[PDB]
Amino acid sequence: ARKYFVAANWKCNGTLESIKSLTNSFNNLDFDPSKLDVVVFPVSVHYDHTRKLLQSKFSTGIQNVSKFGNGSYNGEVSAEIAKDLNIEYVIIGHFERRKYFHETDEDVREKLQASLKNNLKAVVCFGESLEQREQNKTIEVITKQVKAFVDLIDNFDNVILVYEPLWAIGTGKTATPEQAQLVHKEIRKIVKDTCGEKQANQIRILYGGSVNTENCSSLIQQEDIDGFLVGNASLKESFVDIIKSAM
Amino acid sequence: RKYFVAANWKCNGTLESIKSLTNSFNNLDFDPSKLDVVVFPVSVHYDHTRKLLQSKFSTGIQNVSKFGNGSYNGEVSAEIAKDLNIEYVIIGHFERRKYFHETDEDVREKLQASLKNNLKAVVCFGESLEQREQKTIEVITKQVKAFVDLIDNFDNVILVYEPLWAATPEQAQLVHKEIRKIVKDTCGEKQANQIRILYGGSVNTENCSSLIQQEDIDGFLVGNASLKESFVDIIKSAM
Ligand code: NA
Ligand code: NA
């Protein structure tokens, strides 16, 4: 059975003090990290503080990684740098980077390649827009985005996929858990076709639409949904109840 | 004008290399009341670098978000930098304009955000080879006027001229003079004379004295030469 995977994406939020409070509440949840992965993704400049405060049962990672290695790339964090810090996970392809920062599929492929070359584990995100879904292009769009990188995966525990239903983010639409399950099953079929059946059965595919303490169980109880990359709910002490849905 | 010498480490460093390097930099006895010396490590190295450098060194980050806190995956807000006591940000560096499509509107937003949050800003601009062959003053003016009306305290914003077209010290000096005229015309005589205007082209131990001696160059935003222990001689040239 796939190991469930529950991730907190803090995005651009936090102070030193709010992290101290939050991490203290997180550390009070007794869970076994051999039975589920729980990963926290603070802002880059908060990584050291966050890593120090969380107990070792929590994994940690950063929200983006450079497509370039070391050198004259002002502002970027190379995968080589993250490896030297033992940063375990990186998020790649998050829709906010594609939206505000013009990140492309080619960018996602190059960042994944840098990450795996440096022994980082990658959480790689994709998903279609409302206009794409209304034109019945969900499968075409998702296949193209997944095929941009999936053939690079060399270890199916170390890359984690995230379906972001952009048509249901800020649009007034709500994805049901059944709608999400169908998209997850299709993502898994893409992986089987490029990488193999054992590989597709092993890879975690997370839901990355809106997740909170109310809907989390209806989502993770779906057969092909293996956890979540969680947004603002993960800034609340109640995020522990989301982690409990995977325990 | 207090001189200003800055180490831009760009995307370089390991925990061990930064230990060695900061240990050499800490051996230079300079007076931070006389001279500003700023180190700008990679974001994930900020904490380690700040803990290692003596407080005479100021520190900063190489970029800041144009957005506030909230749902902007991968970004670092000015509000976050303020809370961490990050003292400086670099804004508008040519590598961001080049690889990351950063625009003049982005520079102004980022400055406004940084100043709202009491950060000091090292703002970078400069013309390309094509613009030089044809537009130097038109282009640099468009660039400074993107953000200059936002400067409220002329000690806290540092301008940096990057000769993307490349430069002699004499050619650098001319642009610096032009830049200071832009500030004088926009913000006033006394404001123009207070603002530091640094050289952002290639600086090393062999050219640093020729550059700093120029009337309108007030220090440097230094690249690869700042990853070496000899950066201390660069700092010395400004002492
Ligand atoms: Na499931
Ligand atoms: Na001078």
UniProtKB/Swiss-Prot annotation, chain B:
Pfam families: TIM (PF00121)
Protein's GO biological process: gluconeogenesis; glyceraldehyde-3-phosphate biosynthetic process; glycerol catabolic process; glycolytic process
Superkingdom per UniProt: Eukaryota
GO molecular function, one term: identical protein binding
InterPro entries assigned: Aldolase_TIM (IPR013785), TIM_sf (IPR035990), TrioseP_Isoase_bac/euk (IPR022896), Triosephosphate_isomerase (IPR000652), Triosephosphate_isomerase_AS (IPR020861)
Gene Ontology annotations for the cellular component aspect, listed alphabetically: cytosol
Phenotype upon changing F94A: 2-fold decrease in substrate affinity
Principal EC category: isomerase
Catalysed reaction equations from the record: D-glyceraldehyde 3-phosphate = dihydroxyacetone phosphate
Nucleus listed as a keyword: no
Coiled-coil stretches noted in the UniProt entry, renumbered to this chain: none
Residue sites binding D-glyceraldehyde 3-phosphate per the record: N8, K10, L221, G223, N224
Active site, renumbered: H93 (electrophile), E162 (proton acceptor)
Keywords per UniProt: Gluconeogenesis, Glycolysis, Isomerase
Result after altering L164V: 3-fold decrease in substrate affinity
Known pathway: Carbohydrate biosynthesis; gluconeogenesis; Carbohydrate degradation; glycolysis; D-glyceraldehyde 3-phosphate from glycerone phosphate: step 1/1
Subunit structure: Homodimer.
Family affiliation: Belongs to the triosephosphate isomerase family.
Name of the protein described by the UniProt record: Triosephosphate isomerase
Organism: Plasmodium falciparum
